[PDB]
Amino acid sequence: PPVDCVRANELCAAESNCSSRYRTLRQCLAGNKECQAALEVLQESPLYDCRCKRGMKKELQCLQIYWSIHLGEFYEASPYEPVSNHCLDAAKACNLNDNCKKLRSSYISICNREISPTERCNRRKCHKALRQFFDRVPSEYTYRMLFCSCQDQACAERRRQTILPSCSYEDKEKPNCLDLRGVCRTDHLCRSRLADFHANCRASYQTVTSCPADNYQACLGSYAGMIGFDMTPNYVDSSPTGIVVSPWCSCRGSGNMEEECEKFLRDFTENPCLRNAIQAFGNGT
Amino acid sequence: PVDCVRANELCAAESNCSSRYRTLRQCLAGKECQAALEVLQESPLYDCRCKRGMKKELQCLQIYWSIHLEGEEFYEASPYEPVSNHCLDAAKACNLNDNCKKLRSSYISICNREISPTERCNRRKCHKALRQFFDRVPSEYTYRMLFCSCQDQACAERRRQTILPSCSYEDKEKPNCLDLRGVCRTDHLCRSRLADFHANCRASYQTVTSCPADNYQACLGSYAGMIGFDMTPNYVDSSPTGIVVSPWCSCRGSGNMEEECEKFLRDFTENPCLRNAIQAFGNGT
Amino acid sequence: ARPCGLRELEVRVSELGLGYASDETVLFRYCAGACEAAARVYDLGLRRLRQRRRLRRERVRAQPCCRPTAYEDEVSFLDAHSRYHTVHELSARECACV
Amino acid sequence: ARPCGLRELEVRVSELGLGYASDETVLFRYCAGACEAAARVYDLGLRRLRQRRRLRRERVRAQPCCRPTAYEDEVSFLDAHSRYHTVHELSARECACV
């Protein structure tokens, strides 16, 4: 079994030549003759082709290692890639399960707590608790809440409120999407979750579902994996069937890169893969 | 002045003394010994004494008797430093005081618990709890129970029962008083308590009370201080006024000691000092 | 008769009379049942003294009670006006007869 | 109204109805008084569900109880037939509202 990045780094750090070659490559990539020689040595090490896993121990460290030696732009490869009111029903199933009820209430109470009149909540703490809910409660509970189908506005508003968007999603400023992307790519976790969403929800013109390998589950997981970061996506409104999800951003102020900004945003707003995966989940496919 | 436990610490620290005391301890029991004894009998260790209810009382007494060895006196010197019915009333005062109530109940419950049809109680444990009562409850409570005055048999029977004699006093065999004395003198505590009783309760023909220095309190304390040992004394019966106390022994089988045995027993049974002290306590003046 | 212990009931939070206009459900746990242990000597004494009017005319409990020894940390729900609420110690977690 | 706590009473052991023929006295301590704390949401919930006949018609305590949290270890006495007795946990030692 190939080794993950945390372990590969232990092995490299224990031998002075590898460690020095690694330090050199890291320095080269944070920007010749030595750089090329450093790359060549590391290609024979287990750092080359090392990967990470969602819910692993030291996920962040793994990702820091992965990106420190990654050679690179619109779509980055994922570090995780190996080589009747239905929303009310969903909330009931969650509250009747001890683990779901606890972790649900925990993010609700953290995200709903006002810090001051100019601070709706502790956003960082809120995001962290949302990550805990999606990582530690099975998807049979969490996806049923996030992706439930709706026929009226009260159901759709309940769905829109799942992540408590007033704290976790909305902000005083709505940045430009490419600026937000920029901010997301400076954080190791967000960057990786974005790249994993790009890999699993990228629309295909070849498959019946428009999803890669017709794999709805992997797309839904990667979508949910972005909740709790800079690029947290949500239902933009409480329309029942006219579902639009997006990060908290717009293509205003794009200038020369309006085309690229819009292309970026469309992977959320106008993506037949994501659309179809969300709809199939709610319908019982 | 300095007690025997402290006197021994000061000896154990000094070169010549500690050496002589290690010699004496190895001799006991066990010319070079006679020399060690003499030096220690001329050191200040020979003047050390003990106190009732002190910390490490037994150690103190072991030290004292290791150097206070001409032999087999009738009266040994004390190692201790000199200083409706009324019985129901005394039980009430004791049960309304938290500390007395606790320590009373503690001996009663231990002394009253049958072990088997052949063992009335754990006598050792009973005795120990009786000592705790007399040592850790003030005499204002304990003496009022032990020395209360009576006018009828119900009062006298309650007084007789204070120490729960069925367990602590009575036994299948009634030994000869000199044999009992012999056994008592092999135990450091009993031996010392008996010597203290002899020093404070021995009748005098020179004083108005017949007690030494007319000191009723010192006699009563020393009397009560023998409860919980081999020589435990008690009211021999439930006569209201005709008070007679004795250890559990007789002068049968004395032979040529009938004179010595009877003299020993009279210090309890026919002692105007002890008689007067017990009667004056109960009278309240 | 079932002895003192934890019971479970599915309830609509709006049924509870606590001011929450919500159609959400919670698992409400509570303590119920008979305390079946032998009568304490304390209680027998206290019942006798009470009957004899030796007490100073006061509320006295001379019998054990089935009551929670611990409570649920928190439960949350969304109401009809799209407001979230968190309630602390709504349900029992453990029971005992005291 | 005095709140939940320890009360004291001198009693003759023969008044207690526990079979001890003795003129000794004991300090009998017990728990009495009102539990005055604000009502729990648990109890308010439970009271409503009980009124609404939702609790399976069982015995439920929907109010705190003033009861002992600890008992006296032992107390002893001698009876009229010259026999000693020791009683365990006859008095309360500490009280709480639960």
CA neighbours closer than 13 Å in the CB half-sphere of residue B72: 4
- A248's CB contacts (< 8 A; 6+ apart) are A169, A170, A171, A174, A175, A180, A232, A234
C7 labelled as ligand-binding?
A: no
Q: Identify the sign of the CA torsion A53, A59, A63, A65.
A: negative
Q: How far apart are CA A69 and CA A5, in angstroms?
A: 10
Q: Identify the sign of the CA torsion B205, B207, B208, B210.
A: negative
Amino acid at B140: E
Nearest to C48 among D16, D56, D58 (CB): D16
Contact status, residue B170 vs residue B164, Cβ threshold 8 Å: no
Please name which of B169, B105, B89 lies closest in space to residue B137, comparing C-alpha atoms. Answer: B105
CA A59 to chain centre: 13
> What ranges do the domains of chain A cover?
1-83, 84-285
In this structure, the dihedral spanned by the alpha carbons of residues A212, A215, A220 and A225, taken in order and rounded to 10 degrees, is -70
Q: How far apart are CA C48 and CA D90, in angstroms?
A: 13
CA distances from A129 to A112, A134, A168, A227 (A): 12, 9, 10, 10
- D and C touching (3 or more beta-carbon pairs closer than 8 Å): yes
Please, which residues 69-88 of chain D have a Cβ atom closer than 8 Å to chain B?
Answer: 73-78, 80, 82, 84, 86
- B183's CB contacts (< 8 A; 6+ apart) are B175, B230
Taking CB atoms and an 8 Å cutoff, what residues of chain D touch C34? 59
| End-to-end Cα separation, chain C, in angstroms | 19
Q: How far apart are CA A249 and CA B237, in angstroms?
A: 103
Q: How far apart are CA A213 and CA A201, in angstroms?
A: 10
Q: How far apart are CA D96 and CA A19, in angstroms?
A: 64
Kind of pairing, strands D25-32 and D5-12?
A: antiparallel
Q: Kindly give the residue spans of alpha helices, DSSP state H, lying in A44-187.
A: 59-68, 86-95, 98-112, 123-136, 139-146, 153-160, 165-168, 177-185
Residue B29 preceded by cis peptide, ω within 30:
yes
Please name which of B140, B127, B146 lies closest in space to residue B99, comparing C-alpha atoms. Answer: B140
Contact status, residue A177 vs residue A247, Cβ threshold 8 Å: yes
Chain-chain contact of B106 with D74 (C-beta, under 8 angstroms): yes
CATH number at residue C3: 2.10.90.10
Chain-chain contact of D78 with B95 (C-beta, under 8 angstroms): no
Contact status, residue D26 vs residue D90, Cβ threshold 8 Å: yes
Residue with tokens 């009992």: B180
User: How far B122 CA sits from the closest chain D CA (Å)?
Assistant: 16
Chains touching A, CB cut-off 8 Å, 3+ pairs:
C
Nearest to C24 among A91, A154, A161 (CB): A91
Contact status, residue A66 vs residue A196, Cβ threshold 8 Å: no
Kind of pairing, strands B233-235 and D74-78?
A: unpaired
CA distances from C12 to A84, C23, C27, C92, D29 (A): 16, 6, 9, 17, 45
Q: How far apart are CA B153 and CA B151, in angstroms?
A: 7
Tell me B252's DSSP state: T
Q: Does B158 touch chain D (CB under 8 A)?
A: yes
Contact status, residue C29 vs residue C6, Cβ threshold 8 Å: yes
Q: How far apart are CA B282 and CA B275, in angstroms?
A: 11
Chain-chain contact of B157 with D82 (C-beta, under 8 angstroms): yes
Percentage helix, strand, coil for chain A under 3-state DSSP, each rounded to 5: 60, 5, 40
Chains touching C, CB cut-off 8 Å, 3+ pairs:
A, D
Chain-chain contact of D67 with C71 (C-beta, under 8 angstroms): no
Look at chain C and report how many structural domains it folds into: 1
Q: Which domain holds residue C69?
A: 1-98
Residue with tokens 């009229």: D80
Judged by DSSP in three states, D89 sits in coil
Chain-chain contact of A105 with C74 (C-beta, under 8 angstroms): yes
Judged by DSSP in three states, A120 sits in coil
Phi, psi angles (nearest 5°) of residue C7: -115, 160
Contact status, residue B211 vs residue B203, Cβ threshold 8 Å: yes
State the structure-solving technique. Answer: X-ray
Q: How far apart are CA C28 and CA A260, in angstroms?
A: 52
Provide residues of C within 8 Å CB-CB of chain D: 2, 7, 9, 11, 15-18, 28, 30-34, 40-42, 44-46, 48-49, 52, 54-56, 58-61, 64-69, 71, 87-92, 98
Phi, psi angles (nearest 5°) of residue A62: -55, -45
Please name which of B55, B58, B7, B16 lies closest in space to residue B35, comparing C-alpha atoms. Answer: B16
- A and B touching (3 or more beta-carbon pairs closer than 8 Å): no
Burial B213-232 (b: 16+ CB within 10 A, else e): eebbebbbbbbbbbbbbbbb
Taking CB atoms and an 8 Å cutoff, what residues of chain D touch B105? 73-76, 86
Please name which of D35, D25, D70 lies closest in space to residue C60, comparing C-alpha atoms. Answer: D35
Q: How far apart are CA D10 and CA D13, in angstroms?
A: 9
Burial C31-51 (b: 16+ CB within 10 A, else e): bbbebeeeebbbbebbebbee
Amino acid at A10: E
Judged by DSSP in three states, D66 sits in strand
